[PDB]
A = this chain, B = another copy of it.
């Protein structure tokens, strides 16, 4: 199995989820802060440049079978794409083992 981790623009989430549901995929979502090319505003306070604005991102973590992860990566990438800065990244990690807690 593969854990597909997508850091995306928050307003893209439901388009990504519709793309996932289209492929027969449940997922787990987190709110995170993004640092990268696109920057927020800062302010100097006591020898440090403090971030005064921040760039919310949505992290989608979804476990999938090896036989669908490539299709899932492309669907997320196409559903999350705008062509503008701050689009984000997809990281695929291998799952050594997965368990369904409800049944075992």
- Which residues of A come within 8 Å of B, CB atoms? 1-3, 5-8, 14, 17, 26-30, 32-37, 48-49, 57, 59, 63, 73, 76-78, 80-85, 87-102, 104
A58 nearest CB across to chain B (Å): 9
Interface CB pairs A-B, < 8 A, 9: A26-B37, A63-B89, A77-B99, A82-B102, A91-B95, A93-B93, A93-B95, A93-B96, A94-B94
A91 to chain B, nearest CB (A): 5
Is A99 a contact partner of B104 (Cβ separation < 8 A)? Answer: no
Return chain B residues, CB-CB under 8 Å to A35: 17, 26-29
User: Quick one: copies of this chain in the complex?
Assistant: 3
B-chain residues with CB within 8 Å of residue A28 when the two chains form the complex = 7, 32-35, 57, 59
Question: In the complex, what residues of B have CB within 8 A of residue A97's CB?
Answer: 73, 91-92
> Shortest Cβ distance from A42 into chain B, in angstroms?
10
Asked whether, in the complex, the Cβ of B99 is within 8 Å of the Cβ of A90, the reply is yes
* Selected contact of A96 from candidates B48, B87, B94, B98, CB within 8 Å: B94
